[model samples]
Target chain A: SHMARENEMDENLEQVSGIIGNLRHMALDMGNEIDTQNRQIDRIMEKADSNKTRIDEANQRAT
Target chain B: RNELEEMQRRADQLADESLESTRRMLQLVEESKDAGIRTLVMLDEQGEQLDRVEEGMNHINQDMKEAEKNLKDLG
Candidate 1:
């Protein structure tokens, strides 16, 4: 019957919906990972800036 | 030492490189977020489209089930 094909489509829709839901969750996880990378960058940049200042000051006194 | 000054310059260069790397990472993060957002939007639109198709299919299923029942009754 034509209805059998409709049933198959419905099953396909269900499967696709489940897969898409999982993909959304994975995206959320990736966002968290990005946040962690941002924090690490912030710390590294802070330390680098501080060291740059110290090196400049010491070089000035020497010369 | 002149070598010390050179080492300091190298440190400065490394610092600059670190900043650039961080910026690239941030750009990647932004792109990932945008991609994920696009995927979410597509899923929502697709879900709506599927709803309409499902409604049509449901009607067909109902009609077929009734036809089957009617055939049995006649027998």
Candidate 2:
């Protein structure tokens, strides 16, 4: 009976490690996606700034 | 028996390593969740800012049209 229990424990440990490995992969993928989105936001902000400057110049000429 | 004791010792070692791996995985997941939340909030704010920028552009377009009319009248 003791031998059987030890074998079961080893199997359980292997299962746990497999689960953890998958979770780690998922977390890393989400981190990468977040980084990509941050870059996109930066680009959007830059475009807005450019537009603002263009409007300001137009206003100056009109005045 | 000595064999049984050695088997038990090996099982204990494996369990310890598995527990540590599980803890590290949980920590990574928590950090990812926090970062994801922050990114979502920032995206929401950026969306609002874009809306305001578009609105300003519309107003600028109207102003430019009016200016063009004024210049035509001056001529």
Candidate 3:
């Protein structure tokens, strides 16, 4: 029946929409994790620069 | 039906955006990995610098002590 055929089309569309929504949500979570990682790396770089500065000061004193 | 077509259109748009979104996510991840790798290198140098500074400090301290003792012997 044509009615049965249209109903199945709606079912497939529903599934596609549902999965798309989940993909959006999971992707958002991934973005947050990525942001956190970037900050951690940036902090490491900052500390490294400060460490270099302190070592130079100590070298002067030892001289 | 009209409603079904709108639903299909919405689904397609979302799917396309998901592709674009994922691509950017991977690109961000790539950038992050470089920062992380470069950081490791700097930290390594930091360790090396600290060790050399300590070596210099010890060397000078011992040199001063030895010079004072030699002056006492000469007296």
What clash pairs does model 3 have?
Answer: none
- The better-scoring model by DockQ among 2 and 3 is 2
Instruction: Name the weakest run of 10 consecutive residues (lDDT summed) in model 3 chain B.
Output: B22-31
Please list the C-alpha lDDT of all candidates, in the order they appear. 0.60, 0.65, 0.59
- Give one digit per residue, the lDDT tens place, for model 2 in B1-75: 998999989887776676566556656655665676676567668657766766676676667667667766775
TM-scores for all predictions: 0.49, 0.55, 0.50
**lDDT of model 3 at position A54:** 53
TM-score ranking from best to worst? 2, 3, 1
Query: Is model 1 an incorrect, acceptable, medium or high docking prediction?
Result: incorrect
**Residue-level lDDT tens digits of model 2 in A1-44:** 55655566566556556656655765577567657667766766
lDDT for B73 in candidate 2 is: 75
Native A-B contacts reproduced, model 2: 0.00
The sequence of per-residue lDDT tens digits that candidate 1 reaches over residues B1-55 is: 8988999888767655655555555456556656877766665675466556556
lDDT tens digits, residue span B1-75, model 3? 999899988876775665565555555554555565565556557557755655665565556557556655764
Query: Clashes per prediction?
Result: 0, 0, 0
DockQ of 3: 0.04
